[PDB]
Symmetry: C2
Subunit: 174 residues, 2 copies
């Protein structure tokens, strides 16, 4: 009885210590990931600020999103009356999507077609899109993944809005 | 009964040490989230700055009241020094803290009295325990940015390392425009 009590103290302490090892490990994982997202975002921001052409801006954003952030599907479409479409062509295709806020989850078939092309549409389960606007509408930036759980919430798609904020301020310089 | 007593004693120590370790890790994660957000906002505010005054004012107000740093120094270098904020000549800067301007590192966030007195105007700068200093250079040396804390271990923090350096890089790029 006296030993059974202290034995139970040992079981309870072990359970607690195992539980805290799980939390510690889970916290160290998210810490490491935020360090990455932070570093990749920094390099993106500085590379965008140091861009000398519109082509270098586009290349920077696509290279980073695809190969630093490991986004399966990336679409950056700039609007121009001069890839890029007319603003009027953009509203004809996907008008009803743009209206500062990030839209995510299951987009409509015809919107996935315009952003990601006919082929890729079908392998995209979730997607997040944002308008590139700062003192004018400069285009649209979209990211997509086959996992429909990825890019369903604001949490998973938060970086997209941060990039769009900076990218939208950089596009007018060209 | 003494094997089981010995077991409980070591399990308790281990348990206590883990709790504290996990607690600190949670505090650090929370502070880093707060700092990520303030940095994001500062970067955009800087890109949106419409003047030199707006640039320097935004940095100092943000670092002091958003980041909540107790000691803040922003000095711009200029021969013809005319400004609301602090402005000294590059020559004068280098006489006081030139080793750090040239890209040098301090030993354990410890500045020397004359360096503290050059960087920090706060009447209680004598209470600074550690500091981080970074020069503002991008296609030229534009000035110096410095933060200080009463805590001697603060120079090792994510603020002192990551965030300050990134703020400096954006600030160094934006200053040339004015």
């Amino acid at each position: 009885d006296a030993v059974s009590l202290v034995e139970r103290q040992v079981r309870l302490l072990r359970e607690r210590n195992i539980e805290m090892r799980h939390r510690l490990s889970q916290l160290m994982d998210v810490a490491r990931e935020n360090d990455r997202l932070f570093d990749k975002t920094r390099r993106l921001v500085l590379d965008l600020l140091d861009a000398t052409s519109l082509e270098d801006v586009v290349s920077t954003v696509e290279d980073s999103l695809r190969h630093e952030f490991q986004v399966p599907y990336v679409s950056l479409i700039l609007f121009s009356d001069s890839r890029s479409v007319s603003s009027a062509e953009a509203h004809q295709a996907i008008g009803g999507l743009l209206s500062g806020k990030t839209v995510c989850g299951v987009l409509r078939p015809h919107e996935l077609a315009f952003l990601f092309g006919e082929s890729d549409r079908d392998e995209i389960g979730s997607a997040a899109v944002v308008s590139l606007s700062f003192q004018g509408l400069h285009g649209v930036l979209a990211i997509g993944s086959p996992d429909p759980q990825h890019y369903k919430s604001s949490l998973g798609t938060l970086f997209l809005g941060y990039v769009a904020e900076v990218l939208a301020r950089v596009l007018p310089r060209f």
